[PDB]
Structures are given as C-alpha cells and as structure tokens.
Amino acid sequence: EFEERVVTINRVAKVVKGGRRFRFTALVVVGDKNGRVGFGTGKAQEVPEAIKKAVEAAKKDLVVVPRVEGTTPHTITGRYGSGSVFMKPAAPGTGVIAGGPVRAVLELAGITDILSKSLGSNTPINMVRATIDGLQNLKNAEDVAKLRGKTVEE
RNA sequence: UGGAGAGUUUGAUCCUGGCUCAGGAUGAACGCUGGCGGCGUGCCUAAUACAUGCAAGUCGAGCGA
16 A cells, blocks of 8 residues: 645636536655655546546556665755755754755655755646656666776775 | 755646745834743934033142242
C-alpha cells in the first residue's frame, strides 16, 4: 500500500458551444516513504472520481532515489522546461521546508533536509516535473566506484 | 551551523511580466487596557529670544597689610 495527496485540481473546459463540457483534473503524487514516488494526471466531470483515475496513472511510475538516511547524496538544480528548484543536503534534525508541490514530494521519498526555493517555477505542474527530474539524477558512491577505482577518494 | 509561499490578464491553458500580502525592525507616534522586582535609553521637526540657580580656581610653610 502507498500514500497519496491531492496537490491541485482545476475546472478546465469550454463552457457552451451548443453542448457543455466543464471537466476537472488532478495532479496526485503517490509514494511509500521508502524512496519511490510518482505523479499522474486524469480527468473527469464527477468531482472525486478523477482522483482514482489519477492515482491509477501514478502507480505505474516509480523513481528510486539514493539516500544517506535523512538527506540526499549531493546537490543539484532540478530543471524541466520553465521550472527550476534547488535542493541541497542538510544535517539530521532539521525538517523539510516548503515549496508546497516540492514539499509533498520530498516527504514521500522519506527525507529530512533543507530545500532551497523554486527559482523560476511559476505553476504547480512544472514544480512537480522539475522536482522528479532532480531526484532521478543523483549519484551513489558505489555506482561511481563501479566505473572508477574502488572507494579511494574518501 | 539551515535557503518555503499564496493571490490576480483567458471561456479554458503554458509563458513573459508587473503590482499586492504574510515576517524581522523603530533613541517611533497615535489608538484600548493597566500588576511590577529589576535593567537601559529619553530634541530626530523654528540654528525660535533665553528669566532664576550652580559649572575654575587654589595658595595665610610666596610676600605684603
């Protein structure tokens, strides 16, 4: 079993052309607090029924994040399109600071670090796709120790 | 050692982009209420004429009288 949160919903369609559409949508992040997250988007006109379509879209996506049990291994500027968050490791004891779309993703991988703010992000969709693009590009020491010498560098 | 955001142009979007709020401050004023032990700081606006008080004397083993 997993955990989900409703980040945002909308009421997006064209009102009357002779026949009405007025649909909703959602952007649900799912996670397990072990290091695997995801996100997906569905749409329907009955209000909480598009969430079950949205959690359906995110269970088929898992992203493995390295961890030193509380923070991230290094720093990176997770960038996608027009969004850019900044993330950097803390010391164990300080909690995850906000960025609300970026706040709820970092708690469902299971860390307690600082989070620098969204630099150029505007809307809560590209905050999410810039968050996940940051998390899926970190590096361990062991995989680096594969294609180098064997843990010399300290 | 340590670094958050939200709102608003469209029938509905993504972007550029402004304006606006939450917070910390004051040798502040002013608004309501009033128990203090104790610690500090109280002409920042007309350089607008300054009553009354005290702030530079001491030495009688200088020397006169």
